[PDB]
Amino acid sequence: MEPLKVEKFATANRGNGLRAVTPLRPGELLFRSDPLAYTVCKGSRGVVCDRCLLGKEKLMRCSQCRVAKYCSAKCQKKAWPDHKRECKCLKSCKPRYPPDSVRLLGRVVFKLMDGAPSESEKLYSFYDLESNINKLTEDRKEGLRQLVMTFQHFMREEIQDASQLPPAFDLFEAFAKVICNSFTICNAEMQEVGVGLYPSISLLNHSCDPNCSIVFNGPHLLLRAVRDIEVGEELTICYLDMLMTSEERRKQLRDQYCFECDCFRCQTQDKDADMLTGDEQVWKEVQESLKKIEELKAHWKWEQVLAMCQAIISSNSERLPDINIYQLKVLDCAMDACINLGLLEEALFYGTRTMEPYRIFFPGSHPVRGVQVMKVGKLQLHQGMFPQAMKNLRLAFDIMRVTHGREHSLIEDLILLLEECDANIR
Ligand SMILES: Nc1ncnc2c1ncn2[C@@H]1O[C@H](CSCC[C@H](N)C(=O)O)[C@@H](O)[C@H]1O
Ligand SMILES: [Zn+2]
Ligand SMILES: [Zn+2]
Ligand SMILES: [Zn+2]
């Protein structure tokens, strides 16, 4: 159980890209990699584990830095190679914490010296990672320049000048890689909990209608095909969240990756209309309130989320339909708030209402829908609604074994329920 399945090559115009070498079936795993470097992002920090990135109500805090919090003593140990150095820095920053991108790039710079190679850099190393120096706007260069003066500052302790780092390695150029080659680490419940750098995965170009999706069983990362992919076909993923219009997607892809998405979709404006059904006036105020809420989600702060959600869904009932992406986003948030708070009746109220949009927005098999759908069925089973629960849990499996695969332990939970939902229609 080893044979290779992808490879790099030269695109007509868009740089370096992956391709199948033999035909692929949907649900097939193609690549698998640990991070070259990864870190629990500022919000999740103090809430999740500093290694395995898992949420265990209580956490043991850092010996000498008292910032980094651990799952166990074993998690705390194999974390040394990485935490060894950074402990000192964070220690005397207190409380000011380094913006993720830095604390990451701090960790990376030593994992370059590691000597014996990494799997993460098997097909594409760090120094190959496209940075887009040319044709990068000012206020962005002026943006990255800042981070450098912040990095050097934050690091001081272990790094006083560029002579302590390998040559050809350049800091400003390195943030330019990490602005546009980072990876959002999503946990079980499809929550963002960290940022990684997977320099073989970064060989994947962008379609808003991808054929590959990636899922995070902790910091470990899986790339699978979601459809039938023929020899010589360039493999692609969507770097963005699926709840954005072509116009929102255009703006963000210029601001980060410097390009035009020339997918069949970004030209015809797929789903675009359906996304903003309702009067612009109505939801403007919702896409505004979405900038607050989304913050407090990442900071695992549910109680205020549930205030700002209830009030606003209670408000726009008479006028704004669920299928409106920004309305919907509050609905997912609404659901997510209720789950972590244990209001599982309310939880199901909100979750079931989102079910249908999701179907029209996330095509064939998307792991976001998967988990969402799972949370629904799982919410239903609990409520004792066995028939339609078996319906959704089944659906979840039809999505998830192609999105997550057998190698994901989440699947385990899924089947258990299906055999336990069997037990309640006894
Ligand atoms: N759909 C698309 N259209 C045009 N350029 C794209 C694209 N997807 C990715 N890119 C380019 O590739 C970068 C993402 S990294 C993905 C692989 C890239 N060829 C590389 O050398 O690493 C972006 O910053 C952008 O320069
Ligand atoms: Zn420490
Ligand atoms: Zn841990
Ligand atoms: Zn596009």
Question: CB atoms < 10 A from the CB of 343, how many?
Answer: 15
- Which tokens belong to 346? 């309310």
Residue 187 Cα to ligand 3 midpoint, Å, equals 13
User: Is the Cβ atom of 261 under 6 angstroms away from ligand 1?
Assistant: yes
- Which tokens belong to 374? 């799972």
Q: Which residues pair with 8 in a beta bridge?
A: 18
State the DSSP code for 159.
Answer: -
Q: Which amino acid appears at position 125 of this protein?
A: S
d(CA 70, CA 51): 7
212 labelled ligand-binding? no
Q: Which amino acid appears at position 17 of this protein?
A: G
299 labelled ligand-binding? no
Q: Is the dihedral of CA 351, 355, 360, 362 positive or negative?
A: positive
d(CA 360, CA 154): 46
Question: How wide is the angle at C-alpha 298 spanned by C-alphas 223 and 130, nearest 5°?
Answer: 45
Decide: helix, strand or coil at residue 214.
strand
Decide: helix, strand or coil at residue 76.
helix
Taking alpha carbons only, the member of 285, 240, 256, 274 closest to residue 360 is 274
Residue in 14, 18, 223, 240 to alter for ligand 1 test, most ligand atoms within 8 A of Cβ = 14
* Residues whose Cβ atom is located within 5 A of ion ligand 2: 62-65, 87
Q: Where are the domains of the chain?
A: 1-47+183-273, 48-96, 97-182, 274-353, 354-426
Residue 269 Cα to ligand 4 midpoint, Å, equals 9
Q: Which residues pair with 237 in a beta bridge?
A: 206
Taking alpha carbons only, the member of 118, 94, 90 closest to residue 103 is 90
**What is the domain class of 354-426 according to CATH?**
mainly alpha
Which CATH number among 1.10.3720.10, 3.40.50.920, 2.170.270.10, 3.30.1360.200 corresponds to the domain 1-47+183-273?
Answer: 2.170.270.10
- Output the residue whose Cα is nearest ligand 1's atom 3: 261
Resolution of the experimental model, in Å, one decimal = 3.6
Which CATH number among 3.30.70.1520, 6.10.140.2220, 3.40.980.10, 3.10.20.30 corresponds to the domain 48-96?
Answer: 6.10.140.2220
Architecture of the 97-182 domain: Orthogonal Bundle (1.10)
Pairing of strands 220-225, 29-33: antiparallel
The technique by which this structure was obtained is X-ray
CATH topology of domain 274-353: 1.25.40
d(CA 349, CA 354): 10
Identical fold between 97-182 and 274-353 = no
Q: Which amino acid appears at position 149 of this protein?
A: M
Buried b (16+ CB within 10 A) or exposed e, 73-92: eebbeebeebbebbbebbee
d(CA 405, CA 395): 14
One-letter-per-residue 3-state SS of 284-313 = HHHHHHHHHHHHHHHCCCHHHHHHHHHHHH
